[PDB]
């Protein structure tokens, strides 16, 4: 199961 | 017997050519088992091994949901690190990011692991404390006062002791059968000679899961490297491994040589002799 | 900009029998960036049936792939595997050994 966060650099 | 978790995506620019090309891989230690590409037709999370077709609907939209955020996240970020990097828009550019989860042979968590990467180049990873971030340049040093400022460790820690470990046990027990198995390395030892006085020995090791296995030669007991030559584990492509081992010795003393195994399906390490 | 050249090696899938159906495998590996052109040639002629897994990368990003096709080896057949790649000014031929 993948991660949840909507993660920018 | 540790097992691990690990989620892999790619993000290649395509500069005029349309959006970037986005693939993102899934993997139970050497097995792969869910795959997304934008340039597939389904714009799903498709399965790869049998034992994850167990899952609902649920499982399936989320994991789509999920890769779509990852896909457009990648995206937003080609164009930031052409900003932080003073680039044009006419090169071709990679951002790859790691992440996954490893236990030991208790099904203990041992390590979590996220990383990022720029053009084949080391850009930001998480630390081994799993509190911090290490920075591989001073435009990661901008991303990584971004990730200490939103408190990106914490959550991604929460994941990696928590969602990321409890359905990696859950796929080992739904995948028992072929994710817990054993395949011992079958050996064999072929000979050729490349002169009148010197002749090439080399071992085989095939049908072995997993991929780590270590391939010695000894002569006379006595480690040896220099006329050795070893291949890259390489699969078979049924969900088994392949590998060898070659030495060049001089004809007539192949008796000196054993070539040495070492893999997790062997209660004891093998040990190949000529005759 | 990070470049790495591309490892190939040309096996089958099980020991090669003449006469018997087996698969055949170019494995390429250790390459950056992803964008590279695989070929599997039977006497020179490119097989029209490859099939290849899905991009993945190792630790230190290098990406690997596989490709193949069923086939059947005979004593007179050569196969082989053609490799193009940024890293490569000249297209890399690895000839399938079937003790390698």
Redesign the interface.
């Known amino acids: ?9 | 017997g540790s097992h691990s978790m690990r ?2 995506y ?1 993000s ?1 620019s395509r500069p005029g050519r349309g959006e970037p090309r986005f ?1 993102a ?3 139970v230690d050497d097995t ?1 088992f869910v ?1 997304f ?1 934008s340039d597939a037709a389904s714009q799903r999370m498709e399965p ?1 091994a049998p034992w994850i077709e167990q899952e609902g609907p649920e ?1 399936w939209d ?2 789509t949901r ?2 779509k ?2 896909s457009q ?1 990648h995206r ?2 080609l164009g ?2 052409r900003g932080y990097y003073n680039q044009s828009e006419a090169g ?1 550019h ?3 990011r ?2 996954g989860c490893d236990v030991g042979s208790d099904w203990r968590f041992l390590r979590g692991y996220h990383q ?2 720029y ?6 990873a998480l630390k081994e404390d799993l509190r911090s971030w290490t920075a591989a340049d001073m435009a990661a040093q901008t ?1 990584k006062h ?2 200490e400022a939103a408190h ?1 460790a914490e ?2 820690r929460a ?1 990696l002791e928590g ?2 470990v409890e ?1 990696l046990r859950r796929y080992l027990e739904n995948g028992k059968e072929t994710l817990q198995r054993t395949d011992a390395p079958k050996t064999h030892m ?1 000979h ?1 000679a490349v002169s009148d006085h010197e002749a090439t020995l ?1 071992c085989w090791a ?1 049908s072995f899961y997993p991929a780590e296995i270590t391939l010695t030669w000894q002569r006379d007991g006595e480690d040896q490297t220099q006329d050795t030559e070893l ?2 584990t ?5 969900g088994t491994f ?1 590998k ?1 081992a070659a030495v060049v010795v001089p004809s007539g003393q192949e008796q000196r040589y054993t070539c040495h195994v070492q893999h997790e399906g062997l209660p004891k390490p093998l040990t190949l002799r000529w005759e | ?4 050249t591309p ?1 190939i ?1 040309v ?1 089958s ?3 090669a029998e003449n006469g018997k159906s087996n ?1 055949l ?1 170019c ?1 390429v ?2 390459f ?4 590279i052109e695989v070929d599997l040639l039977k006497n020179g002629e490119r097989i029209e049936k490859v099939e290849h ?5 190792s ?1 230190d ?3 690997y792939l ?1 490709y ?1 096709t069923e086939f059947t080896p005979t004593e007179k057949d050569e196969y082989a595997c053609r490799v193009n790649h940024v890293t490569l000014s000249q297209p890399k031929i690895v000839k399938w050994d079937r ?2």
């Not at chain 1, 199961?1 to 650099?9: A, E, G, H, P, Y």
């Not at chain 2, 053009?119 to 930001?124: C, P």
């Not at chain 3, 897994?53 to 990368?57: Q, V």
């Open positions: 199961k993948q991660w949840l966060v909507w993660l920018l650099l | 989620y892999f790619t290649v693939i891989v899934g993997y792969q795959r590409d790869r499982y989320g994991e999920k890769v955020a990852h996240t937003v970020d930031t690190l071709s990679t951002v790859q790691m992440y990022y990467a053009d084949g180049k080391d850009y930001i991303t971004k990730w990106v959550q991604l994941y969602t990321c359905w072929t050729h080399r095939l291949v890259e390489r699969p078979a492509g049924d392949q060898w | 900009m990070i470049q790495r490892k090696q096996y899938r099980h020991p698969f495998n494995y590996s250790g950056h960036p992803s964008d897994s899905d991009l993945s990368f630790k990003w290098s990406f596989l193949y003790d390698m």
